[PDB]
Amino acid sequence: QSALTQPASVSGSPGQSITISCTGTSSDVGGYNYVSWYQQHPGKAPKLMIYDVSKRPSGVSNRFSGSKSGNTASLTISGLQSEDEADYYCNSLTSISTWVFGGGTKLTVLGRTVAAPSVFIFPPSDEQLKSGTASVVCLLNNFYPREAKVQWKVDNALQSGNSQESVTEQDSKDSTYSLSSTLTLSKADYEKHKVYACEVTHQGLSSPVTKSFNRGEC
């Protein structure tokens, strides 16, 4: 499915005007003018915002408009409000054989100040080493906005495939978020190296924050 190229996320303060862009194939957003836009809030079914290019369906606010030029379409959202915080998807027909969506752009409405993570790391539990595995957990706490990141390092070499992450929903009381990142390994993959680390990148940090240990300590 030839997914329409979109930005991953965009942001603005309330009352500002912003645009989400959508680039397709010459068969998909080039060609026909059927290019729709959908909104969804987290965990619930989409709503149609724009149907044919630039057309709102009934009950949609005139804060939403759209347009097309060549192979690319756009959704403009004027006068931002916190109700706009959603994933936005463009969509079009390639042909009557196939509809295609875009990758989806999250919209952030800038209703609170940046918050830096409190950063922590957990070396392997001995009870998990007794079951032959080693999970190392890196915790980032009550930060804003949502797009923090973690790098995992072993003998200072960057890891891949050995690690996974979870993030909170938005904090219902202060609108920050937290993240648990996790490296995970066999006991043999704990014995192969000497030093283990996580390193944190986020907008609230002037440079990345590292937490680390040696297996001889742990």
């Binding site: 409190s118 957990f122 539990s125």
Partner: peptide, 22 residues
């Protein structure tokens, strides 16, 4: 299975320690 995320010097910052369960 439930495993302790044991507090340590590496899970502590600014007089606050993180601890947990996996």
């Amino acid at each position: 299975s439930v495993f302790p995320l044991a507090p340590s010097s590496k899970s502590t910052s600014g007089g606050t320690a993180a601890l947990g369960c996996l």
